[PDB]
DNA sequence: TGTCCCTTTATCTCTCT
DNA sequence: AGAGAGATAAAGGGACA
């Protein structure tokens, strides 16, 4: 018969038991493990469902799924059971960091490499464990750690980079390649092209950093001499992964989009300057004559939607959802363009289409309140979080729907909301902050870490903030979040 | 195939003023 | 708040054994 039958049945036999305790996996979770981790991962999750969730380890089910769902997932699962207590006691890592290191293709290699190299990277190269964790927490982590161990001295001394810059380069998939390409090309790009080290670091500091570096070296001259692009614009384009693809595409499409479609070089650069920029550029070439037709959307609007990561996905979702959202849900194209014009534009739009009636009917929000929550990066996360937490924040903590909406209406709205649910009790009950002040701190980008910093300072007080009253901490948190507090801590 | 590494795309969260 | 920066995830190919 068909080969993969004996495998698929073996997959389904086991996945039946995983559905209940201890792990209680949902079809969705089982698909994810099967897809990436494969069949070996699913059988392992089962083989050891007790060892990981029980004791010592006490992994959550989601942490188990996180580690299992990668090529080699079984190897990682086995390695985690052996190395988690060692890394957590010998090197002072938290279980969550260990999990985070494990949760990538080659997790075992990364974990074993952290075990081996973390003391030498910290003592001989003066890196922090945080920094070693961040480098390890990508595919090929092992390669990036060994390459950092090998190239830190030459990069800092012969090339002038700071160790923070080296970590930033190493801290992506393909970190090793980025590191070596920076070693080779840094003088070429600085001397032959007038680039600063900082700009080169920005180009090298994404996935496929190597490809972007080589492609800036190759395409910067054409792009600057022949199309009159400045080196700032080429760097902006290249500093986002898929960089190479975006640069190669801009070379072709810049004159086309400018001549045949009436865009400025400036607008093309903006569309190109995002993850998957090549896809955005191409979708705009295709869809500008269509979306801007029947006196419909303006080019400016089309460009705005395109000028975010996943601009392609956002543009296509606009094309498909604009009529049903306007007609059946009462929205304007203005509002629709607004939802689409952030990273995750597609997700936000589909979640609006799905949740607007429930948010209004069951929760008594206005369509405008839904549009505002939706109109930030992470819109979908915020909307789904508002659906779950609006009733519990109002009834358990006395918050008004308005206040919930204000917390939700920012990037990271979901994190801010969950953090308000968590910390409002201690902030108010135990430290006498008014609910209004918690709301105020939470109603900004960076809401979550702002609240966590406030709690950190009140629960385990640092005398470097002694001369600051609660009212003053609060004003600082509102004004500048965690960064403000942390700076104040440095005084 | 199982595992490890790399690149590209999309999505989500926080920073800096 | 808007631009910029900083993370995290998903899926696919190349490689090798
Ligand atoms: Mg970026
Ligand atoms: Mg594969």
Author numbering: 231 to 721
Authors' description from the paper:
To test this speculation, we generated dHax3 variants with the 34th residue on repeat 7 substituted with different amino acids.
Each TAL effector (TALE) repeat comprises 33–35 amino acids and recognizes one specific DNA base through a highly variable residue at a fixed position in the repeat.
